[PDB]
Amino acid sequence: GHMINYPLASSTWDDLEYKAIQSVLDSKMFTMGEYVKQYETQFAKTFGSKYAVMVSSGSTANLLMIAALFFTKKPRLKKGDEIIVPAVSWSTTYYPLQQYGLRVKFVDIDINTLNIDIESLKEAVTDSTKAILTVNLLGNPNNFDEINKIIGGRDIILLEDNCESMGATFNNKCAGTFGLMGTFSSFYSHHIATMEGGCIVTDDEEIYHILLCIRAHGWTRNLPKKNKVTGVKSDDQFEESFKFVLPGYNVRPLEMSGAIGIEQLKKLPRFISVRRKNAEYFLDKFKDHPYLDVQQETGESSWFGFSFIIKKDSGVIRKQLVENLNSAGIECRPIVTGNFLKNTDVLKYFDYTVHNNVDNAEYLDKNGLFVGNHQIELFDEIDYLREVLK
Amino acid sequence: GHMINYPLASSTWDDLEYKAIQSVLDSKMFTMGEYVKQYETQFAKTFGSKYAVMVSSGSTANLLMIAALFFTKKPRLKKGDEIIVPAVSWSTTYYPLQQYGLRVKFVDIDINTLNIDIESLKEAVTDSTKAILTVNLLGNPNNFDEINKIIGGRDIILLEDNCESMGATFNNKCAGTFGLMGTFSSFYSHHIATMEGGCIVTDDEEIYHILLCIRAHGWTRNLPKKNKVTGVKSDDQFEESFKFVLPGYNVRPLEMSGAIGIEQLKKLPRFISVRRKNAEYFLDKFKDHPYLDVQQETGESSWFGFSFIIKKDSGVIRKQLVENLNSAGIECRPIVTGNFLKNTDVLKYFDYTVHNNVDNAEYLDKNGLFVGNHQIELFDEIDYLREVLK
Numbered sequence: 015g016h017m018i019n020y021p022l023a024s025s026t027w028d029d030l031e032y033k034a035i036q037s038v039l040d041s042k043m044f045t046m047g048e049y050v051k052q053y054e055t056q057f058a059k060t061f062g063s064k065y066a067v068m069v070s071s072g073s074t075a076n077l078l079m080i081a082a083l084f085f086t087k088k089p090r091l092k093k094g095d096e097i098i099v100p101a102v103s104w105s106t107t108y109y110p111l112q113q114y115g116l117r118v119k120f121v122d123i124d125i126n127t128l129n130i131d132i133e134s135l136k137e138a139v140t141d142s143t144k145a146i147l148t149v150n151l152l153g154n155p156n157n158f159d160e161i162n163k164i165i166g167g168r169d170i171i172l173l174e175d176n177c178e179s180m181g182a183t184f185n186n187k188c189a190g191t192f193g194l195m196g197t198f199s200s201f202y203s204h205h206i207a208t209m210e211g212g213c214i215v216t217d218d219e220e221i222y223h224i225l226l227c228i229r230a231h232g233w234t235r236n237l238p239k240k241n242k243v244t245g246v247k248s249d250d251q252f253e254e255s256f257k258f259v260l261p262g263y264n265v266r267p268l269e270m271s272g273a274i275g276i277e278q279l280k281k282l283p284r285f286i287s288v289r290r291k292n293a294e295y296f297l298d299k300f301k302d303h304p305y306l307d308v309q310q311e312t313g314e315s316s317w318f319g320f321s322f323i324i325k326k327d328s329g330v331i332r333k334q335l336v337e338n339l340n341s342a343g344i345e346c347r348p349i350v351t352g353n354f355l356k357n358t359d360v361l362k363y364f365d366y367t368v369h370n371n372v373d374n375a376e377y378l379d380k381n382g383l384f385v386g387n388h389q390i391e392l393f394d395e396i397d398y399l400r401e402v403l404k
Numbered sequence: 405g406h407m408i409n410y411p412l413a414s415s416t417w418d419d420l421e422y423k424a425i426q427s428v429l430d431s432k433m434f435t436m437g438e439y440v441k442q443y444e445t446q447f448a449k450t451f452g453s454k455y456a457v458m459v460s461s462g463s464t465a466n467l468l469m470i471a472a473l474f475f476t477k478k479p480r481l482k483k484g485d486e487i488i489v490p491a492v493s494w495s496t497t498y499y500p501l502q503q504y505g506l507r508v509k510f511v512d513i514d515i516n517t518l519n520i521d522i523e524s525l526k527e528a529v530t531d532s533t534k535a536i537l538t539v540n541l542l543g544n545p546n547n548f549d550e551i552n553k554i555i556g557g558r559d560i561i562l563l564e565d566n567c568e569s570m571g572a573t574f575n576n577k578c579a580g581t582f583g584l585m586g587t588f589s590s591f592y593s594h595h596i597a598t599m600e601g602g603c604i605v606t607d608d609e610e611i612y613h614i615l616l617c618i619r620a621h622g623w624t625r626n627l628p629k630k631n632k633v634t635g636v637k638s639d640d641q642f643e644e645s646f647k648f649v650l651p652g653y654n655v656r657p658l659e660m661s662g663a664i665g666i667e668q669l670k671k672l673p674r675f676i677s678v679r680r681k682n683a684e685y686f687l688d689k690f691k692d693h694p695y696l697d698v699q700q701e702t703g704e705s706s707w708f709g710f711s712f713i714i715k716k717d718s719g720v721i722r723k724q725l726v727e728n729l730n731s732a733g734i735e736c737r738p739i740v741t742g743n744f745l746k747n748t749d750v751l752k753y754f755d756y757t758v759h760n761n762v763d764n765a766e767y768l769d770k771n772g773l774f775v776g777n778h779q780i781e782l783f784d785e786i787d788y789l790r791e792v793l794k
């Protein structure tokens with residue numbers, strides 16, 4: 015089976031977005047400008063954060079997020095610092111840690127939530143832990159309350175990779191706003207899509223400043239006269255426009271993406287709505303499934319897609335399932351990357367350690383799968399899927 | 405709101421580019437794909453390189469260019485390794501060196517060509533030198549023949565930042581193809597423009613493959629069955645498609661840029677021809693300027709723009725010239741960034757050293773200025789310029 019009728023991805027666009035590109039074309043201004051800024055403003059508003067910075071991708075968002083910590087007047091991070099992460103996530107969640115010389119401490123996930131295992135996190139955290147980098151998997155937010163209990167008020171930075179859970183909420187607060195900084199992705203087929211695109215949110219003005227700076231050449235052009243980076247900008251452009259203060263990058267997003275994001279954000283409430291209705295329907299259909307477990311929701315998940323974990327001693331073979339789905343026209347993939355720890359070749363480059371074991375991650379790596387969720391009603395696709403997975 | 409008699413920049417697009425953008429819309433495939441691939445083939449073919457890798461910007465081309473060196477089966481670079489660079493260039497030429505923990509050795513420029521001072525280089529090179537990162541300034545190529553004499557068999561890697569000199573040639577050879585790798589930029593107002601964009605060229609297959617991997621998640625999806633990173637790609641999709649082997653990034657370009665890029669390459673030759681003809685005229689007008697020195701051409705420059713250095717013992721103050729230019733409706737700027745070494749703040753982060761001195765760079769910093777060159781005839785503009793600069 016190779017004929018796909020129930021795909022993982024689909025378009026979130028309509029006329030409005032095409033018109034938006036048009037507006038850009040007419041403007042003949044393609045470099046990051048007005049729209050990006052407007053986009054950022056609404057973005058922060060939408061999620062309930064003070065600041066938001068748009069970047070080229072969710073991956074680059076992650077990059078700047080980590081980097082930023084090295085540049086505070088009083089650097090918040092230092093080479094060799096210990097950072098805790100879950101064993102399951104996207105590759106670019108981990109790379110920047112390596113690229114910045116951090117010591118990475120891996121923590122197993124919770125088999126029901128798919129998020130970091132709270133119990134293990136409990137023990138994993140020590141006096142050496144400088145930061146915790148959480149990942150809201152597949153739309154499901156982490157239990158921040160519990161996380162917070164662990165920190166117990168210490169000076170441990172909390173960070174969030176919210177690339178898969180835009181719109182998710184916990185305790186009424188938007189996922190991605192819990193940490194010092196939160197990242198998002200607007201890549202094709204995410205809660206929203208801007209072709210390629212990412213964002214970083216924060217309530218910290220210094221960090222905010224740093225970001226603006228590191229996003230583009232390490233210059234002061236995007237900074238305000240009075241800023242937390244250089245204090246006060248010289249009034250001499252010949253000089254001013256040509257000074258570099260931080261070792262940054264060029265990860266500016268395109269104006270087009272910004273203009274598109276604007277249209278997309280307006281639709282967000284509806285997208286979340288549909289996705290959630292679909293999930294409700296799904297949970298109901300798969301409630302007592304004989305050999306598959308579904309993701310256990312925390313707070314209000316933005317249900318990026320649907321995960322399945324073959325029940326222990328169910329004798330079910332992932333391979334057949336997959337075959338079966340495909341033959342039926344259902345597209346499927348591993349749960350993200352599966353157990354990240356399997357990537358031995360890339361790990362060679364990391365300075366890392368594993369807390370305890372990553373048993374659950376290993377199980378998932380072998381018995382997990384996932385099908386798409388859309389901002390479109392999938393009742394019928396769901397009935398069929400249930401039919402197939404008998 | 406403009407009111408410019410002589411702009412630094414201009415658009416290089418016509419209906420063709422707009423047409424290309426339309427074509428992509430219609431295709432509904434916005435993520436890097438066919439167009440990008442077509443572009444790369446055309447690109448390599450155009451400059452005489454075996455391979456080309458399109459990236460999100462010239463800046464990221466640079467980044468990947470440095471990074472790739474650490475991933476060869478037999479790593480070409482390691483932390484602490486010494487790399488030589490000229491004192492004048494864009495900030496993104498430098499950051500990656502810092503980001504990879506290399507030991508930076510700044511070398512002064514030649515006040516005439518504006519490129520690295522060949523004589524100092526000779527002196528700067530030691531057995532500790534691992535690589536030389538050259539920069540082709542403002543369209544002017546370096547004298548590779550001499551540099552080559554300098555390397556004299558030794559195992560020193562030659563690199564090129566060709567972001568300002570697309571189209572330049574030396575000894576019948578295209579700038580960017582001299583070093584193991586070469587970087588290019590297609591940002592607004594370059595020789596070609598794709599909104600944002602970069603490219604890396606190479607004749608090395610292993611490097612080529614490394615680049616393919618790190619550009620996009622450090623995965624294998626863009627790698628051939630038989631490739632130099634993993635050797636042979638599994639046939640199992642649910643597995644092979646989710647494997648990470650190198651710590652890269654997500655610096656993919658948009659399918660759109662590649663589409664635009666395709667059209668731009670065709671126009672490239674004329675663009676170059678027009679700029680060179682402008683240069684020819686400019687030179688005749690300024691060749692014997694009483695107080696201004698012009699750029700000394702090496703090989704066949706692609707004349708990115710027109711540089712001027714106030715002659716020593718002239719009694720002419722830069723500040724006053726700028727004022728005049730400006731009141732005259734003539735846009736001017738510093739030569740690139742000027743003396744990079746003046747950037748004390750950002751230097752704090754570097755492991756660097758300065759060979760001898762950067763007197764030339766310091767001179768240029770206080771005495772140089774730059775005016776635009778375009779792919780449109782500027783006869784009248786040049787005349788006016790000469791009039792203002794009486």
Ligand SMILES: Cc1ncc(COP(=O)(O)O)c(CNC(CCC(=O)O)C(=O)O)c1O
Binds near residue numbers: 074
């Ligand atoms: C946990 C996590 N972090 C970061 C990212 C990435 O953001 P971005 O894609 O804009 O770099 C993703 C999404 N991962 C992917 C991989 C697919 C792809 O980018 O081709 C996604 O955005 O779909 C992710 O799931």
Ligand SMILES: Cc1ncc(COP(=O)(O)O)c(CNC(CCC(=O)O)C(=O)O)c1O
Binds near residue numbers: 463565591592
């Ligand atoms: C030597 C050199 N390296 C790298 C770059 C950068 O390529 P890119 O800009 O696509 O990241 C430039 C151009 N420098 C500038 C600064 C102006 C700007 O980016 O707004 C250019 O793109 O013209 C450069 O001159």
Ligand SMILES: [Mg+2]
Binds near residue numbers: 781782783784
């Ligand atoms: Mg004319």
